[PDB]
Ligand binder design. Structure first.
Ligand SMILES: *[C@@H]1O[C@H](CO)[C@@H](O)[C@H](O)[C@H]1NC(C)=O
Ligand SMILES: [Ca+2]
Lengths: 54, 224
């Protein structure tokens, strides 16, 4: 759930780190901009990593 | 930068871009071999990009130099963002010219109402995303510490101050972190965090560089 069924969170930090998240609606992993802090566990360094979990 | 303007192309020779996989943070050149940025921008493999106005076109003044040492503040806390500052030593010195040059460290603390210049290649939208090729600038005043704490109750530490506007619309944003807040010709701030970007009553929160002048000078001296 925490890893696969929560929506993407940028968080308060202001970096732009490209991360992957699983979108249930789409059935796939998609890239988003992560701010660098906080956020949630639906947040992977690669597409491969994301699909494997989700 | 949301609600700003395109910077003049020769006017920010101290602005740098940190690149690892993507353009992910900004920074400021403070000596020939050293850059100041945010501790939350830490990565082990960084290329520092100097002399840029447009991050997608070669203008002729670019110097892209690997980071040899990357030193987060020794009391950085990732959960509170306390002491969100870092130093990068370049693998080779930058060559100082009209388009690549240093920004002065501050010789007085920043005061409320002082006018500053915030810059970066961050998101320009509060609605969705538009990451610009050309460097953006925002003219913004330092806010009172009382306004800062009222905007972010219990979250403002001794390392932090707010710069910008309580009305929404004008702020730094994602990809701007690490970049410069310059006031009276000196580096006073490092872009750090905020709740959203340019939202009502949620100004940007910045690391107060004046608190680390001794740490910066000592770190440079110890790693020479
Ligand atoms: C999830 O995927 C759907 C279908 O591709 C897309 O419409 C939607 O915008 C995605 N959600 C988010 C939050 O990006
Ligand atoms: Ca360029």
């Amino acid at each position: 759930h925490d890893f696969c069924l929560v929506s993407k969170v940028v968080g308060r930090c202001r970096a732009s780190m490209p991360r992957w998240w699983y979108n249930v609606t789409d059935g796939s992993c998609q890239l988003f901009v992560y701010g660098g802090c906080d956020g949630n566990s639906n947040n992977y360094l690669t597409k491969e990593e994301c699909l494997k979990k989700c | 930068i949301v609600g700003g303007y395109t910077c003049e192309e020769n006017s920010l020779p101290y602005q740098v871009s940190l690149n690892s996989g993507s353009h992910f943070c900004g920074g400021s050149l403070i000596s020939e071999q050293w850059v100041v940025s945010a501790a939350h921008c830490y990565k082990t493999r960084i290329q520092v990009r100097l002399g840029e106005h447009n991050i997608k076109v070669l203008e002729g003044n670019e110097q892209f130099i690997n980071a040899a040492k990357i030193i987060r503040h020794p009391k950085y806390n990732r959960d509170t963002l306390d002491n969100d500052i870092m130093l990068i030593k370049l693998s080779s010195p930058a060559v100082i010219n009209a388009r690549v040059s240093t920004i002065s460290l501050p010789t007085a603390p920043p005061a409320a109402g002082t006018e500053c210049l915030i810059s970066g290649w961050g998101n320009t939208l509060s609605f969705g995303a538009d990451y610009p090729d050309e460097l953006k600038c925002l003219d913004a005043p330092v806010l009172t510490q009382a306004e800062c704490k009222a905007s972010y109750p219990g979250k403002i530490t001794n390392s932090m101050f707010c710069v910008g506007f309580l009305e929404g619309g004008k702020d730094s944003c994602q990809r701007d972190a690490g970049g410069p807040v310059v006031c009276n010709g000196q580096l006073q701030g490092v872009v750090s965090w905020g709740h959203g970007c340019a939202w009502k009553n949620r100004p940007g929160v910045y690391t107060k560089v004046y608190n680390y002048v001794d740490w910066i000078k000592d770190t440079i001296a110890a790693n020479s």
